[PDB]
Amino acid sequence: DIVMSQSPSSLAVSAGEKVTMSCKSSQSLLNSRTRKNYLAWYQQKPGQSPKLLIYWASTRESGVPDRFTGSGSGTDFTLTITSVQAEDLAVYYCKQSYNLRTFGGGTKLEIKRADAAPTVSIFPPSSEQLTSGGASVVCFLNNFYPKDINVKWKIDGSERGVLNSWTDQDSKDSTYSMSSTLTLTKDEYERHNSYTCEATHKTSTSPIVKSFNRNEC
Amino acid sequence: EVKLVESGGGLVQSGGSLRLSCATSGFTFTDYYMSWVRQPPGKALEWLGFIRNKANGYTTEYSPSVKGRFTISRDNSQSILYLQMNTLRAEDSATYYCARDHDGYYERFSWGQGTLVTVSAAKTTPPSVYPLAPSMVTLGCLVKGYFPEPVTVTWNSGSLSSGVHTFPAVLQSDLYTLSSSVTVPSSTWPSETVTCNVAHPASSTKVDKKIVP
Ligand SMILES: C=CCO[C@]1(C(=O)O)C[C@@H](O[C@]2(C(=O)O)C[C@@H](O)[C@@H](O)[C@@H]([C@H](O)CO)O2)C=C([C@H](O)CO)O1
Ligand SMILES: [Zn+2]
Ligand SMILES: [Zn+2]
């Protein structure tokens, strides 16, 4: 059968630098008659459909920036991006069309940038939730880098139903954002006063602390 | 302008069947092979099959992964591509894309937006949508307790997109929850309105939630 493999699985590169990724076929994709390699590259940005970049191994599709170059032949192919830009964040797939079609497993490209501290914001439960018996407290930690971050919830000063979610990297500023949601019953919510989101990130030895008090709502 | 638009995705039980459609325009449909490709959440693209062009008698081919179980067809009067899926299983849960394929010369797929299929026994549950209200100021919406995916979130009907972060849904106790934040100048809110628009196609839910101070 035709097995397609890609390397690396993932990597991060700073804007302005060169990116090299590889694609191997278990069988030559060079058609004898047309003398072309039936190997294409697709770019899939976060939340989007794949987009054609390169086909016939080295032919760059119209509209695709010149910084993308496909090369290689037979069983081994390379996609090179020179002067990488923030918007190039994506998973890149190669695909053979020599015998039906088969995709490789993709290479995830992340963008490296300068460390950036998160902007933290905390939100009390809405009255429209409380009326149904639930109480979710939300903290947004926005536009930081790198991705690793710690969130602690404290209630009346004591550390404690938590839902965390990170965005994909931003295509413009190459930061991450995360949401942390603490969900309590209304009955338990009403037993305590201070609700505190504490974010610790390598950008400071001081946690960023955001809080609200129930009595102040 | 070429357009490919999938439809038909949604929730279906194991063992059941579902048929997807792909409406096309902007090119001579019968000249082209058409492929279907799927992608499970967080995983790689998988080519499923194609149907050839008129010159090749509109014949079909399939990946071994779905041959015998999936069928491709096309309506050449209206330029619509179809994928019939039978005996569905959890592993078929994925975003399904149609793609324009070979024209007899070029080797390339020159794609739709995709339609999400979820194979599960769980019931459809509409979201609860809650406002998140407190230089620059950050507001949000909490879209809680829905099934299946997806939901869409916009802010002021699309007019706010910069400064928007929509957090991927996470499944806890058989329901999804997601949130979205929007950051705007404090001079503009609450002076001006800010509203999150949330849709959950599986339950035909449409919600506009104004962020009130
Ligand atoms: C199907 C039998 C012969 O098919 C070819 C041939 O000359 O071998 C090629 C074929 O094109 C495909 C195909 O299977 O339909 C699609 C194409 O994208 C590419 O995969 C080639 C494959 O590389 C083989 O060359 O196969 C089309 C036919 C012609 O339409 C008429 O026979 O020829
Ligand atoms: Zn941002
Ligand atoms: Zn308590």
Q: In angstroms, rounded to a whole number, what is the distance separating the alpha carbons of residues B36 and A84? A: 31
CA-nearest of B29, B12, B30 to B20 is: B12
Residues of A in contact with B110 (CB under 8 A): 52, 61
Q: In angstroms, rounded to a whole number, what is the distance separating the alpha carbons of residues B177 and B98? A: 28
Residue boundaries of the structural domains of chain B? 1-121, 122-213
User: Reduced to 3 states, what is the DSSP secondary structure of residue A173?
Assistant: coil
Structural domains of chain A, with CATH = 1-113 (2.60.40.10), 114-214 (2.60.40.10)
Residues of A in contact with B112 (CB under 8 A): 49
Structure tokens given for B158: 């699309």
Q: E strands of B78-189, at which residues?
A: 80-85, 94-100, 115-119, 128-132, 136-146, 152-155, 164-172, 175-185
Considering every ligand atom shown, identify the ligand nearest to the alpha carbon of residue A96 and give its number.
1
Residue type for position A114: A
Q: In angstroms, rounded to a whole number, what is the distance separating the alpha carbons of residues B164 and B90? A: 32
Q: E strands of chain A, at which residues?
A: 4-7, 10-14, 19-25, 39-44, 51-55, 59-60, 68-73, 76-81, 90-96, 102-103, 107-112, 119-123, 134-144, 150-155, 158-159, 162-166, 176-185, 194-200, 208-213
Q: How far is CA A74 from CA A24, A36, A57, A103, B84, in A?
A: 9, 9, 10, 16, 35
Pocket test for ligand 1, best of B101, B102, B107 (most atoms within 8 A of CB): B102
Q: In angstroms, rounded to a whole number, what is the distance separating the alpha carbons of residues A118 and A138? A: 15
Asked if the peptide bond before residue B148 counts as cis, ω within 30 degrees of 0, the response is: yes
CA-nearest of B144, B50, B63, B130 to B98 is: B50
Q: Please tell me what DSSP assigns to residue A207.
A: P
Q: Is A130 exposed, middle or buried (0-12, 13-18, 19+ CB in 10 A)?
A: middle
| Sign, Cα dihedral of B152, B155, B157, B163 | negative
Identify whether the C-beta of residue A144 lies closer than 8 Å to the C-beta of residue A168: no
| Sign, Cα dihedral of B182, A193, A160, A133 | negative
Q: In angstroms, rounded to a whole number, what is the distance separating the alpha carbons of residues B96 and B39? A: 7
Q: Does B63 touch chain A (CB under 8 A)?
A: yes
CB atoms within 10 A of CB A154: 15
Identify whether the C-beta of residue B21 lies closer than 8 Å to the C-beta of residue B82: yes
Q: In angstroms, rounded to a whole number, what is the distance separating the alpha carbons of residues A61 and A52? A: 7
Question: Does 2.30.30.90 match the CATH number of domain B122-213?
Answer: no
- Count CA atoms closer than 13 A to B209's CA, side-chain side: 23
Q: In angstroms, rounded to a whole number, what is the distance separating the alpha carbons of residues A70 and A55? A: 8
The per-residue DSSP string of A73-94 comes to ETTEEEEEESS--GGG-EEEEE
Q: Assess whether the C-beta atom of A97 lies below 6 angstroms from ligand 1.
A: yes
Q: CB distance B61–A165 less than 8 Å? A: no
Distance A212 CA to ligand 2 centre (A): 24
Q: What are the φ and ψ backbone dihedral angles of A66, each rounded to 5 degrees?
A: -60, -15
Q: Does B133 touch chain A (CB under 8 A)?
A: yes
User: Reduced to 3 states, what is the DSSP secondary structure of residue B174?
Assistant: coil
Q: Assess whether the C-beta atom of B38 lies below 6 angstroms from ligand 1.
A: no
Q: In angstroms, rounded to a whole number, what is the distance separating the alpha carbons of residues A30 and A26? A: 12
Specify the residue for token string 């294409």: A40
Q: How far is A127 from chain B (nearest CA, A)?
A: 9
Q: How far is CA A52 from CA A94, A149, A157, B188, B190, in A?
A: 10, 35, 53, 40, 43
Q: How far is A37 from chain B (nearest CA, A)?
A: 9
Q: What are the φ and ψ backbone dihedral angles of B130, each rounded to 5 degrees?
A: -120, 140
Task: Identify the bridge partners of residue A138 per DSSP, sorted by sequence position.
Answer: A123, A181
Q: Is B95 exposed, middle or buried (0-12, 13-18, 19+ CB in 10 A)?
A: buried
What is the DSSP pairing of strand A107-112 with strand A10-14?
Answer: parallel
Structure tokens given for B10: 């949604």
Specify the residue for token string 């991006």: A81
Q: Which residues are close to ligand 3, an ion, with C-beta < 5 A?
A: A 191
Q: E strands of B86-127, at which residues?
A: 94-100, 115-119
Tell me whether domains B1-121 and B122-213 share a fold: yes
Q: Please tell me what DSSP assigns to residue B192.
A: S
CA max distance for chain B: 64
Q: CB distance A121–B181 less than 8 Å? A: yes
Task: Identify the bridge partners of residue A120 per DSSP, sorted by sequence position.
Answer: A141
Looking at domain B1-121, which CATH architecture does it have? Sandwich (2.60)
